[PDB]
Design a binder for this molecule. Structure first.
Ligand SMILES: *[C@@H](O)[C@H](CC(C)C)NC(=O)[C@H](CC(C)C)NC(=O)[C@H](CC(C)C)NC(=O)OCc1ccccc1
Ligand SMILES: [Mg+2]
Lengths: 235, 240, 212, 195, 244, 233, 231, 222
């Protein structure tokens, strides 16, 4: 057939480029960074109404100061999360401190290109890694299966990404509050989702310095959805 | 050692070996899972192409992983034994180290993890098996029902079916299963499970297997005559 | 070193001394023989300082990983068994550890596990570990009841360490107190034996053999 | 640990095991249960080096419980005893051997017979009407040689066991803080809460 | 490199079938027919040797029926060399179990173990599967007399009467017709030979083209005897049943 | 773990104003047997370094080969091998010190005591010690074995501290070294009269002196010594 | 064509296509410039962003106090190779108490990249590196290609549109080599050199990345308002 | 039989002030009854405003310091030139020491610097990695001579206020850098008198927010 670690004539790794196509088929995930905190939100996308939606876990805690959202082949993310959690805890053991969000992201990205003929193929999932540390404050990173990671003020990944990113382009400014960011994630998720957005098929989360990483209750998100509907009807 | 990458991405972002493993599941005999208010029922299809079978000794479709958790499946029968064995070993290992039996969610997460590992490891093909894992957590009366598949994704279900003609029985369950009021009793839950299989099975003789799991390690398999009584009552009400 | 821990109505009392020695030489009077693994778990330290410190802060990393993976607080039984299974792997290599893993959970209630470098793992209501363990046992066994007030239980633990600090040459320095409840542990101060002894003697009327 | 006894009567097996745990100069506990249920009709008591005893017992327990789930069937006491012996016979030539002695009391539901097996840390198995490990046998075997019958009842077995414990409490130097007694018969395993 | 020449033996087809397993089953369908019939008082194993010669030394020959232990035997259909590899593994597994538990291995446990080995060659390793199908005839004190079959996929199932190898479709129909639950060994012997006699591709069924075996409790009191039939004994049972 | 068989005794050295001096006798002992009388224990490395080695001779010959190999390896793909990227004393020492500590940590030591004497690129004097345990130290005067006990006291009278180095000439320093070697011949039962001496100067370079002998010895007073106390004849 | 499936296969004209495809990845990468005088050596790198919300990908990596590089191509491969250099620089210091020569650092990178071009299963590195450093023989600039070829130069540039900067340096050769004891002027020349490779976009405060090493100057990286002086 | 350990003597002392910290040590290196060197530095600037000394067997001491300096270097590489805090350095050193639990570094390690609030900090280690933050700690050969003096003159132990007679303690007033250096110099002068392995010279490293300063003082050479 052909090598798994083969370069294309354009200078790109075939397998890495193909895994990026799998990520485009995944459910939408959005992240927004502010001076008051970072917000993470995902589309759950249940395949059937009999599927209990609260069991869909696409937002995940890595440590108290670092959270993570996923999009693509979500099964592949489990070993990446396990590594991230281990790396975060191990660093605390070795250095008696929290690990920098960038350093955690770098550790996860080191796994990416460890494939050949090590694992048999790249990961088919992208991650939004959000957190806080004392040095660089509130941060949001986008970790790909290429081994590359970019920092972002705001970012969307998944099937409705390029439409959502264009919306984030206009809406984001450096003086956004946490409440404003929450509504903004809900607004953009509602825009790109196939089914109508509610508290059961969408999930919010945030990371603040005081309270740390928190996944929002369905009752708490429901109120923010109702608050969104009213403010859009206000003009 | 044999290191060949069998599960790989294609230009359109698909892993065909994982997708072809799902086709093996589509071929397998139908399996269904329904959870009531205080129970879970696992229904399984037995294809009647094989008679002169010895039903005493033939491998049963529903397997006990521990005294409080069961596992049924659709797909390759030989492959399922490997997952069942690993699951049984992990169940005893969990009891040994944590001094507490596995939760249904944990056992599912393990089996799903094994299935995923076989989709990005060299020299191996994915499991051609999807499982339904059901039971009750230790000292808990809330019913649990989970599904897994070759890719390694897993999730919880109020009711679910897998295997051949699963599209039809899922159609039945989606209109007949009410979340606000699930099957309150064992009778109601078994009846709904047998009804759902009767949409697909053919004859209601030795083609339907039923296994009821209740809280506190109370697991029993219904006999032919007991199931036959449900089959009789369903059709007599249908003649109207 | 002298350490103790006991179950009672108001949860668990944990009390330790503060002395460390190298032969007859007193290396330190200000050591923490108690490690806070988490807001609900405590670990006592007796035997080798390094062995206990290293593997109990490691234990805390494993407990943190557990509640990340399982979204639930680790049981005292599971936490203790992680440590006991670890030291059993090193059995024969020369580790020196005598520890109590103390905590409270909903399913278990207040629980204490004695864990040992020999591989021993025991559940129990009362434990005293260290070179001055026998002295502490004397006071504890004669005054222990299930129906003790948090105030009276704290004093008994403090007093039991004092008894050992006095008689055992390799015990002393100061007393660290902890009280473990349904809502977590609560530190109850560092008590210098040099001041506590004279205070207790005067108020309690005990230690009449000593002159002051 | 210290004293573990076993006696096979007409229709049951009775195991008695001391409650004391002594780590050096102090008795750390006086209510320790030196036994593990391997299966519904099989019980194993144990005594030897600290740590190794519990580690070995729980390891055996896990393996038998695994077998039970896999086959949906309870192994015979004879089969369980043979498995245990092999593990100890393997262990004695290891880097660091398990320093554990055991008694295995079981009721065979197929043959409708009680069975008692004595196995030491070397992997030396013997089936017996009554057995013991350590210094216990030195006192108790003379009494059992005199008083024992194959047709004794469970109540008679407990009385003969009381006579053994009384002799041990009189002539042994160590205070073993009494014994926990457990009966194994056709109905399963139960503990005698007053002894 | 080497990838160029790899057949990839352990992959799914677009339909979700294992190529090599399916082709191995095609190989087995050309092998000599082997039949197993379970009765209340014993089990029969009958099998047809493939186009023999007059110069073949029959009395010292064995290609179909093999002994795994004193209680369990197997009938082979496929590559004989492949079967002997697995047979020696099964013989060892039975002895391992006997050494560990001091009891004869239950039939199903032995069958599951061999079937798990076959399964492994279909999922990992990149090697071709064993082109063999077994009929297991055995006895233990839990389930009594038992018949199983396993195939290259590693899947196994229990049976009252079963055939493997050539003309199984025709053979299974004939067994399904004349088999009854209250049947005895002597009757099962007659059924097995009559079925082979009708399904055989040869002109006539003779003693030199057959291997035969019975597992009977027809041993003096509560115990089980294996009887691998000799050429002269196969000749006599052929006359008795009225085939020659 | 081993035991040393064929051994070499003291190596002595000191710093002076423009460089360093090092010396060692030419003996290879086999226990009390003075077996080999032509053993060179000072091994030059380039034109700026001399490594003096005591202890096990078989291990010395091994080290000698490592240094020979080091020079070869440094020259590979190195156009400045005889200039800016030549081997320094500090490089050679640190290499040996690394090896010695690694070997002690595997419980299989090189049974030696080593002194690396040389002059750096900037003209600075280099003098450092290392032994079978991987222990290292530097001083204006360094000596191994018996030299540590007898030579150092004599050499420290010349250079007692760092400030005495610029005040010490090469003639004064060589005189002190040669005297120390005589004293060791008087008092070390495993020493020889024959020895080698090396000078590394920042101006005049490396001067390697072979076949030196201890001379101007005092023995005449022995004739007057009779008995062990009371004896007169 | 038929001879580009893996790195172990020569073409009929003696070409290694997988290596050439890896070389192509560098050309897609953002521009970076390297130049030196007798006293100092400078790296200038144009950083690239994903969009306006995103950060600008870092281009320069420190290897030691006296050595470092800038990258162009697959960033993870630069992380692997820079990690290897860090270890080799470190091995030289710990074992020999010796700062690793820049020329010898190039030789080690060449040999590491080569092994990936002659063996089955693996792949060539998909990144180009510009290594600067100050050692015992003064200032140095190296250009690394993943074919294995390493070259010592006065100045150079790699990445997209790098030919413009390379021509400018070829004209300015006699001028910038003489800029001794003046770091700011040497950077000015490097900033003016990278400007010849710009189209549409210009050098902004979070776009530009500069690094310098010299006689009494440790390898330091300048980003943000620290490079506003040179805009 | 080969003995992989040795004893190079020496003695070290760390004192933590209110906004500063000192780490002192003599410059003598010995084996048995011989002097190897009269000036062999024992206390080292490790970067990030941290000073360190590993006293006992010098080969193990040099190895450990060398490895920790290396750890600081890689901490900068791996974590974006982040400053290594004194508490994080201490935990890192524990793992270096315990990593050789079954073939130990035969040294008494002490580090000194400033904590993240700017207050003076001293950490003390045993050979297998157990550690503890302290206000005052002496290590090495003459540690038994020095520590009691420091309990008395730094923490005012067994001292009370005149007139009250044992009822009121002497208040724990803070010490300046000049006052601390006096106690250090007197400690080493006294230790030199009564311990044969102590002498030749005294080198003190002082750590403040402004950086790391050095001071050297002569000691008796007998
Ligand atoms: C009391 O049990 C106390 C508990 C700790 C929490 C402090 N332990 C000790 O005092 C213990 C005494 C035992 C070993 C007899 N002391 C130590 O472990 C001791 C601690 C230092 C800080 C004094 N360390 C020790 O003795 O040295 C270890 C060593 C020595 C020499 C060579 C290798 C290792
Ligand atoms: Mg002195």
């Amino acid at each position: 057939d052909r090598g798994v670690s083969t370069f294309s004539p354009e200078g790109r790794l075939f397998q890495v480029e193909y895994s990026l196509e799998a990520i485009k088929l995944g459910s939408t995930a959005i992240g927004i960074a502010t001076k008051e905190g970072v917000v993470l939100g995902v589309e759950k996308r249940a395949t059937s109404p009999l599927l209990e939606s609260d069991s869909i876990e696409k937002i995940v805690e890595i440590d108290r100061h670092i959270g993570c959202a996923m999009s693509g082949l979500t099964a592949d993310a489990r070993s990446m999360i396990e590594h991230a959690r281990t790396a975060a805890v191990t660093h605390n053991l070795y250095y008696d401190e929290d690990i920098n969000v960038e350093s955690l992201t770098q550790s996860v990205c080191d796994l990416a290109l460890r494939f050949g003929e090590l694992m048999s193929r790249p990961f088919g999932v992208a991650l939004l890694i959000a957190g806080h540390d004392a040095d660089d404050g509130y941060q949001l990173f986008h970790a790909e299966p290429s081994g590359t990671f970019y920092r972002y003020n705001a970012k969307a990944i998944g099937s409705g990404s390029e439409g959502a990113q264009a919306e984030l382009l206009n809406e984001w400014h450096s003086s956004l509050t946490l409440k404003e960011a929450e509504l903004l994630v809900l607004k953009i998720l509602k825009q790109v989702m196939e089914e109508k957005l509610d508290e059961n098929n969408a999930q919010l989360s945030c990371i603040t310095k005081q309270d740390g990483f928190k996944i929002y209750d369905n009752e708490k998100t429901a109120e923010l959805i109702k608050e969104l509907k009213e403010k859009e009807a206000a003009e | 050692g044999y290191d060949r990458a069998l599960s790989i991405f294609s230009p359109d972002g698909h892993i065909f070996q994982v997708e072809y493993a799902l086709e093996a599941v589509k071929r397998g005999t139908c399996a269904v899972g329904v959870k009531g208010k205080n129970c879970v029922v696992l229904g399984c299809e037995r294809r009647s192409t094989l008679k002169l079978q010895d039903t005493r000794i033939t491998p049963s479709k529903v397997s006990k992983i521990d005294s409080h958790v069961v596992l049924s499946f659709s797909g390759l029968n030989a492959d399922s034994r490997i997952l069942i064995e690993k699951a049984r070993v992990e169940a005893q290992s969990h009891r040994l180290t944590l001094e507490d039996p596995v939760t249904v969610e944990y056992l599912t997460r393990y089996v799903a993890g094994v299935q995923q590992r076989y989709t990005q490891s060299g020299g191996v093909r994915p499991f051609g098996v999807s499982t339904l894992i059901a039971g009750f957590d230790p000292r808990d009366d809330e019913p649990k029902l989970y599904q897994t598949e070759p890719s390694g994704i897993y999730s919880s279900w109020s009711a679910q079916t897998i295997g051949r003609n699963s599209k039809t029985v899922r159609e039945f369950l989606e209109k007949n299963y009410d979340r606000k009021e699930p099957p309150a009793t064992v009778e109601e839950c078994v009846k709904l499970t047998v009804r759902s299989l009767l949409e697909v099975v053919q004859t209601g003789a030795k083609n339907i297997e039923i296994t009821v799991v209740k809280p506190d390690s109370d697991i029993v398999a219904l006999s032919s005559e007991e199931i036959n009584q449900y089959v009789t009552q369903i059709e007599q009400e249908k003649q109207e | 070193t002298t350490t103790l821990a006991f179950r009672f109505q108001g949860g668990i009392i944990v009390a330790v001394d503060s002395r460390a020695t190298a032969g007859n030489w007193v290396a330190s009077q200000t050591v923490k023989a108690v490690i806070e693994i988490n807001p609900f778990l405590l670990g006592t330290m007796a035997g080798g300082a390094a062995d206990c410190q290293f593997w109990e802060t490691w234990l805390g990393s494993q407990c943190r990983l557990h509640e990340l993976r399982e979204k639930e607080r680790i049981s005292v039984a599971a936490a203790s068994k992680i440590l006991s299974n670890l030291v059993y792997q090193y059995k024969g290599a020369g580790l020196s550890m005598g520890t109590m893993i103390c905590g409270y959970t909903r399913k278990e209630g207040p629980t204490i596990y004695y864990v040992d470098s020999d591989g021993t793992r025991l559940k129990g209501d009362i434990f005293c570990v260290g070179s001055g363990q026998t002295f502490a046992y004397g006071v504890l066994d004669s005054n222990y009841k299930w129906d003790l007030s948090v105030e009276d239980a704290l004093y008994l633990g403090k007093r039991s360490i004092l008894a050992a600090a006095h008689r055992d040459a390799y015990s002393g320095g100061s007393v660290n107190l902890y009280h473990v409840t349904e809502d977590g542990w609560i530190y109850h101060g560092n008590h210098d034996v040099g001041e506590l002894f004279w205070k207790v003697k005067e108020e309690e009327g005990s230690f009449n053999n000593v002159i002051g | 640990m210290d004293i573990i006894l076993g006696i096979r009567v007409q229709d049951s097996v009775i195991l008695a095991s001391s409650k004391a745990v002594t780590r050096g100069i102090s008795v750390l506990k006086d209510s320790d249960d030196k036994t593990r249920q391997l299966s519904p009709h099989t019980l194993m008591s144990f005594a030897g080096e600290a740590g190794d005893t519990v580690q070995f017992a729980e390891y055996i327990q896990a393996n038998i419980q695994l077998y039970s789930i896999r086959e949906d069937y309870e192994l015979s006491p004879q089969a369980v005893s043979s498995f245990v012996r092999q593990e100890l016979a393997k262990s004695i030539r290891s880097r660091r051997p398990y320093q554990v002695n055991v008694l295995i009391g079981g009721y065979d539901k197929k043959k409708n017979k009680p069975e008692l097996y004595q196995i030491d840390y070397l992997g030396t198995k013997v089936e017996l009407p009554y057995g013991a490990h350590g210094y216990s046998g030195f006192y108790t075997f003379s009494l059992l040689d005199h008083h024992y019958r194959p047709d004794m009842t469970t109540e008679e077995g407990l009385d003969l066991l009381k006579l053994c414990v009384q002799e041990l409490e009189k002539r042994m130097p160590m205070d073993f803080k009494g014994v926990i007694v457990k009966i194994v018969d056709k109905d399963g395993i139960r503990q005698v809460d007053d002894f | 490199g080497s990838r160029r020449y790899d057949s990839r033996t352990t992959i799914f087809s677009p339909e979700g079938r294992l190529y090599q397993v399916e082709y191995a089953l095609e190989s087995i369908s050309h092998a000599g027919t082997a039949i197993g019939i379970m009765a209340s008082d014993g089990i029969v194993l009958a099998a047809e040797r493939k186009v023999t010669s007059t110069l073949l030394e029959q009395d010292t020959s064995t290609e179909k029926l093999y002994k795994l232990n004193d209680k369990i035997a197997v009938a082979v259909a496929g590559l004989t060399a492949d079967a002997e590899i697995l047979i020696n593994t099964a013989r060892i597994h039975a002895q391992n179990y006997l050494k560990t538990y001091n009891e004869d291995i239950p039939v199903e446990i032995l069958v599951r173990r061999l079937s798990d080995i076959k399964q492994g060659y279909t999922q990992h390793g990149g090697l071709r599967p064993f082109g063999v199908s077994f009929i297991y005839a055995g006895y233990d004190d839990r389930y009594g007399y038992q018949l199983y079959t396993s195939n290259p996929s590693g899947n196994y199932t229990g049976w009252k009467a079963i055939s493997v190898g050539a003309n199984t479709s025709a053979a299974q129909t004939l067994l399904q017709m004349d088999y009854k639950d209250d049947m005895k060994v002597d009757d099962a012997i007659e059924l097995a030979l009559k079925t082979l006699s009708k399904t055989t591709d040869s002109s006539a069924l003779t003693y030199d083209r057959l291997e035969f075996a019975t597992i009977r409790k027809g041993a003096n009191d509560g115990e089980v005897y294996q009887k691998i039939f000799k050429p002269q004994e196969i000749k006599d049972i052929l006359v008795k049943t009225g085939i020659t | 773990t081993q035991q040393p068989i064929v051994t070499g005794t003291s190596v002595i050295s000191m710093k002076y104003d423009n460089g360093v001096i090092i010396a060692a006798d030419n003996l290879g002992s086999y226990g009390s047997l003075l077996r080999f009388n032509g053993v060179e224990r000072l091994i030059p490395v380039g034109d700026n370094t001399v490594v003096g080695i005591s202890g096990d001779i078989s291990d010395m010959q091994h080290i000698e080969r490592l240094l020979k190999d080091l020079v070869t390896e440094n020259a590979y793909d190195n156009p400045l091998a005889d200039a800016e990227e030549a081997l320094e004393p500090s490089y050679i020492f640190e290499y040996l010190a690394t090896v010695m500590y690694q070997r002690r940590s595997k419980m299989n030591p090189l049974w030696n005591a080593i002194i690396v004497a040389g002059v750096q690129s900037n003209g600075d004097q280099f003098l450092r010690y290392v032994n079978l345990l991987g222990v290292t130290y530097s001083s204006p005067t360094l000596a191994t074995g018996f030299g540590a006990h007898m030579a150092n006291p004599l050499l420290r009278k010349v250079v007692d501290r760092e400030s005495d180095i610029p005040k010490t000439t090469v003639q004064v320093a060589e005189e002190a070294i040669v005297n120390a070697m005589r004293v060791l011949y008087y008092r070390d039962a495993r020493s020889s009269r024959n020895f080698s001496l090396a000078i590394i100067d920042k101006n005049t370079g490396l001067t390697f002196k072979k076949n030196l002998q201890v001379e101007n010895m005092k023995w005449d007073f022995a004739k007057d010594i009779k008995g062990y106390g009371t004896q007169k004849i | 064509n038929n001879y580009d499936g893996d790195t172990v296969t020569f073409s009929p004209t003696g070409r290694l296509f997988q290596v050439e495809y890896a070389l192509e990845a560098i050309k897609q990468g953002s521009v970076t410039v390297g130049l030196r005088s007798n006293t100092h050596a400078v790296l200038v790198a144009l950083k690239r962003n994903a969009d306006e919300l995103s950060s600008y990908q870092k281009k320069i990596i420190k290897c030691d106090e006296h050595m470092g590089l800038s990258l162009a191509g697959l960033a993870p491969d630069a992380r692997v190779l820079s990690n290897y250099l860090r270890q080799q620089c470190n091995y030289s210091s710990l074992v020999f108490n010796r700062k690793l020569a820049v020329e010898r650092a190039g030789h080690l990178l060449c040999d590491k990249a080569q092994k990936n071009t002659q063996s089955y299963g693996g792949r060539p590195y998909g990144v180009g590196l510009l290594i600067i450093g100050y050692d015992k023989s003064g200032a140095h600039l190296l250009e690394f290609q993943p074919s294995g070829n390493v070259t010592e130069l006065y100045g150079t540039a790699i990445g997209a549109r790098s030919q413009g900067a390379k021509t400018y340096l070829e004209r300015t050769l006699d001028t910038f080599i003489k800029i001794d004891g003046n770091p700011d002027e040497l950077i000015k020349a490097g900033v003016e050199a990278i400007s010849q490779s710009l189209r549409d976009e210009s050098l902004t405060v979070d776009n530009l990345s500069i690094a310098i090493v010299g006689k009494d100057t440790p390898f330091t990286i300048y980003d943000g308002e620290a490079v506003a002086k040179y805009i | 039989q080969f003995n992989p350990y040795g004893d190079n003597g020496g003695t070290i002392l760390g004192i933590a002030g209110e906004d500063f910290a000192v780490l002192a040590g003599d410059t003598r290196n010995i084996t048995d009854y011989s002097i190897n060197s009269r000036y062999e530095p024992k206390v080292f600037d490790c970067g990030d405003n941290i000073v360190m000394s590993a006293n006992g067997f010098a080969a193990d001491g040099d190895a450990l310091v060398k490895r920790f300096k290396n750890s600081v270097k890689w901490y900068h590489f791996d974590h974006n030139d982040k400053k290594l805090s004194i508490n994080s350095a201490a935990r890192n050193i524990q793992h270096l020491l315990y990593g050789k639990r079954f073939f130990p570094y035969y040294v008494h390690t002490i580090i000194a610097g400033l904590d993240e609030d700017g207050k003076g900090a001293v950490y003390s280690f045993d050979p297998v990695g157990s550690y503890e933050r302290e206000q005052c700690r002496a290590g090495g050969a003459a540690a038994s001579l020095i520590m009691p003096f420091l309990d008395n003159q730094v923490n005012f132990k067994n001292q009370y206020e005149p007139g009250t007679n044992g009822k009121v303690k002497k208040p724990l007033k803070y010490l300046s850098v000049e006052e601390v250096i006096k106690l250090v110099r007197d400690s080493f002068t006294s230790a030199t008198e009564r311990h044969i392995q102590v002498g030749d010279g005294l080198e003190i490293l002082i750590v403040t927010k402004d950086g790391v300063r050095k001071e050297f003082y002569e000691l008796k050479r007998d």
